[PDB]
Amino acid sequence: NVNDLKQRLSQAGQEHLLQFWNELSEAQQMELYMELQAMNFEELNSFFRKAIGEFDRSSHQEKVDARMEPVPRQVLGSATRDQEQLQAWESEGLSQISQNKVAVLLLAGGQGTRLGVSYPKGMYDVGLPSHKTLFQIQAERILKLQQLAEKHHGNKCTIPWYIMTSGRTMESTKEFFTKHKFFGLKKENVVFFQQGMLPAMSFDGKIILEEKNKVSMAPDGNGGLYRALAAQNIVEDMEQRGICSIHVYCVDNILVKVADPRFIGFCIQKGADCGAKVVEKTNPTEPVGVVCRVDGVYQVVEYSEISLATAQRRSSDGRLLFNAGNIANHFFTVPFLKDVVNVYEPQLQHHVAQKKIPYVDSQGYFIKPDKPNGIKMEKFVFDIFQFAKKFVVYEVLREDEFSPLKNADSGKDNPTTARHALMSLHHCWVLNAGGHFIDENGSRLPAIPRVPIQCEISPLISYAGEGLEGYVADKEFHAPLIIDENGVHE
Amino acid sequence: NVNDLKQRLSQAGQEHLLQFWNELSEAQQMELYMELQAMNFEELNSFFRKAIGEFDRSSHQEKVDARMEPVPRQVLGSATRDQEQLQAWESEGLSQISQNKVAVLLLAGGQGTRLGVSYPKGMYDVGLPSHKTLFQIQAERILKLQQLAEKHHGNKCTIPWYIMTSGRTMESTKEFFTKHKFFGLKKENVVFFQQGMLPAMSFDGKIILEEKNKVSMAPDGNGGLYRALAAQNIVEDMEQRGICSIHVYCVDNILVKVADPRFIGFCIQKGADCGAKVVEKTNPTEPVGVVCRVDGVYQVVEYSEISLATAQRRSSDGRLLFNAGNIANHFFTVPFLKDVVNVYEPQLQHHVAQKKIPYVDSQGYFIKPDKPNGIKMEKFVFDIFQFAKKFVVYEVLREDEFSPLKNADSQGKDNPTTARHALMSLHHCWVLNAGGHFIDENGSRLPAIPVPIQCEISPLISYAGEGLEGYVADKEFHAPLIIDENGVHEL
Ligand SMILES: [Cl-]
Ligand SMILES: [Cl-]
Ligand SMILES: [Cl-]
Ligand SMILES: [Cl-]
Ligand SMILES: [Cl-]
């Protein structure tokens, strides 16, 4: 077993991964053996070879800035500037769901490390009055739409829920889901699968040991999505369920319209093989990727790749030229997703960033470098746009659809902001449905008072502000106001 | 003299302000008598009459949402959508400055109560590397323009600084300015004056006693600006200084472009007598009043007065219909302002608002009520757009021009970290746009968009991002980074 690993490491020029073999406890060494026997060394060498020949190849080419073109008018639909077309699209979305032809695919992360937390993000509770986690909010949205679809089409239906997770976080996410009785969905319609990993490598392409017996690993990027789908036969599953369309999104957006039937409807009606939802970027320095065309191909340019000039460029109308802010919310046809998984994905190389990788040295001290000593390779989910034959963009309102949980409260994209955004939305819903909020003396608060008016509507009651006139129309409320399966509460 | 008041308060139905007289230390009597003798009763009832013949009157009228139309495109200028125009407006601005035809008019408030401090906002150190106060940052923008305007027209020139402040904060602000030798400016060119004040009223227009010997007093709002100018002849002082244009602005915005020549230039070119700078409101629930017309009359509708429906209305272009977010930044002709002060402001009545006024009960006790018991009367700066013969509106970018200091440093917007970041980010950009570059510990350059990259440039060096090429073009820096009268420094 070990002289077959040896042979393979040698073939790959990675002999040094057993540097410390003769210093390990039998248990430590058949813990490291496991890790290595899993990896494919021939392939990783290829990945590295091809990826370096770009981080030093297109590195003698034009800065992306000059190759960049804005989204064409002809391609984008707008939640705002396309009125009561929304209706037609909503209906098309619910018809699709109704016929069991839609599924959601969730990029759950791994651990809430940036968050300061050991549990995966989305078991995070941002301190909503209901204190539901992101998982639960999202489950309830799936479930709400299976109710609203049955209401408008009379047929009982399901959105199967594919959830991708890091290998650390699987059994826990499963246990969390099992403990909560899948929040009312059926175990059968929740499918957990695991992201792959890539090792950190030296500039010279030597795989790096984090410890005498751990190789320095990290996820392969959001774009590891596709390789993971193949590995776990996720597509065969979707086909045998008879699924046509996948909504793809990330766990961290608390406002996320899971399986948004407007988006799905849009994309279905326009026969798109691929759509990306976006919010309008209005501040040049906003840390957000822009959807755009590079050398004529659709993709996202990350926010840390653009010149301040590019960012500050303004179209005729006063807006930013590159204003299609990417929120990691996508539509895929199954057929197009299947060709990306079985054909177009391998047809890619990895993105390469220089990283300061901590490693164990010859003498066994854990060093922490102060210049970068190696690279991480990542694939991005939005890299496949280039293969869409008919790609669309759908512009939504930030405050209705996007407020991500990225940081701890130590200034933006944190629990306070996420929470404030969901409560402001739901506040507005009540006003939009005829409701009013009222202070202790019972005189009514203005719609824009100024702490923040606390409001929370279970998704089971309203997916996106519908279904509330019965609860709130011409009634006044003292916040905190909650609306759930047992009605309103003050 | 003490008997006059009895009759004076009798002849206004305010006799109850001596309610506790017989109980007071006669030191407490001097105190109250002093407070009371200097007031114009009759005027205060008259205000309360004319201000209540309207908080009742509009009562039985259409809501403000049905009488609101946007600013017409013909009136609106824009830093984004209008280009070589900007260099043109700029140089007109400078020339006006350079012929000494320009003053500024600062609304400092009173104490930074909302901010959790006993001093006015002008003195707030948002915690920049230079630890400069707002007052300083502003003063030094007045100096820089003087220098810039002179390099561009020959003549040396001044931009007088009329500072309005609360009666409390006056002598603290003079002490502060003196402590700092007027930040570089001459003391002859800083002219301070005091905001007046109004007492709280019961719903019956009876003046309210906060304690046995204290009338419950408040500021008369920004709009007292006008009355405040008349009292201390501030108009004549400008007329005889030979000033034509006034840039009027409030103190709490760290990015404010004091006497901005672009905005002045626009207003002069368009021949406006009145101008409001504004920034694009894009989020319906942003608490920022909007400039617009109500019954075809120009004014500001405050964010607290509109329905959500109005806030969420949208023009064909996908933008908010009412997107002219008002940043308390205006341009006045003196003639106009002269007329506003002497003639038009007295024509107005006061805005009325129920409040919970701490008052003293006849059973001695000092009560802070839970229900609102009386009213504040106020006036606003923007109440007088309607009298302008030519109103104009100038849109600018938020990130360059507007970041206000409103709340104490929570984990919350519009506060010290916010303000601090906005100025840093702005200057960080100023550097990149002048060919500068930024560098980690190891020396590889870091992206235009990455704590935040700390960068502070003295108004002395650069007002709005000009003159940096001298210091930063094709050059690579390591932050924190200060550029300063005495060179660049990597701190
Ligand atoms: Cl192998
Ligand atoms: Cl839990
Ligand atoms: Cl809160
Ligand atoms: Cl009610
Ligand atoms: Cl009198």
Swiss-Prot record, chain A:
Localisation per UniProt entry: Cytoplasm, Cytosol
Binding residues for UDP-N-acetyl-alpha-D-glucosamine 1: 107, 109-110, 195, 221-222, 250-251, 289, 302-303, 326, 380, 406
This protein's pathway: Nucleotide-sugar biosynthesis; UDP-N-acetyl-alpha-D-glucosamine biosynthesis; UDP-N-acetyl-alpha-D-glucosamine from N-acetyl-alpha-D-glucosamine 1-phosphate: step 1/1
One BP term from GO: UDP-N-acetylglucosamine biosynthetic process
Binding, UDP-N-acetyl-alpha-D-galactosamine 1: 107, 109-110, 195, 221-222, 250-251, 289, 302-303, 326, 406
Pfam families: UDPGP
Gene knockout outcome: Embryonic lethality ar 9.5 dpc.
Keywords, sorted A to Z: Cytoplasm, Immunity, Innate immunity, Nucleotidyltransferase, Transferase
Domain of life: Eukaryota
Name of this chain's protein: UDP-N-acetylhexosamine pyrophosphorylase
Organism annotation: Mus musculus (Mouse)
Gene name of the record: Uap1
From Swiss-Prot, chain B:
GO molecular function list: protein serine pyrophosphorylase activity; UDP-N-acetylgalactosamine diphosphorylase activity; UDP-N-acetylglucosamine diphosphorylase activity
UniProt binding sites for UDP-N-acetyl-alpha-D-glucosamine 1: 107, 109-110, 195, 221-222, 250-251, 289, 302-303, 326, 380, 406
Compartments (UniProt record): Cytoplasm, Cytosol
Binding site for UDP-N-acetyl-alpha-D-galactosamine 1: 107, 109-110, 195, 221-222, 250-251, 289, 302-303, 326, 406
InterPro entries documented for this protein: Nucleotide-diphossugar_trans, UDP-sugar_pyrophosphorylase, UDPGP_fam
GO biological process, one term: UDP-N-acetylglucosamine biosynthetic process
Main location: cytoplasm
Enzyme Commission number, as recorded: 2.7.4.-, 2.7.7.83, 2.7.7.23
SUPFAM superfamilies the UniProt entry points to: Nucleotide-diphospho-sugar transferases
This protein's pathway: Nucleotide-sugar biosynthesis; UDP-N-acetyl-alpha-D-glucosamine biosynthesis; UDP-N-acetyl-alpha-D-glucosamine from N-acetyl-alpha-D-glucosamine 1-phosphate: step 1/1
Keywords: Cytoplasm, Immunity, Innate immunity, Nucleotidyltransferase, Transferase
GO cellular component: cytosol
Superkingdom classification of source: Eukaryota
Catalytic class of the enzyme: transferase
Assembly and oligomerization: Monomer and homodimer.
Similarity comment text for this entry: Belongs to the UDPGP type 1 family.
Name under which the protein is recorded: UDP-N-acetylhexosamine pyrophosphorylase
Source organism (scientific name): Mus musculus (Mouse)
Phylogenetic placement of the source organism: Eukaryota, Metazoa, Chordata, Craniata, Vertebrata
Chain's gene name: Uap1
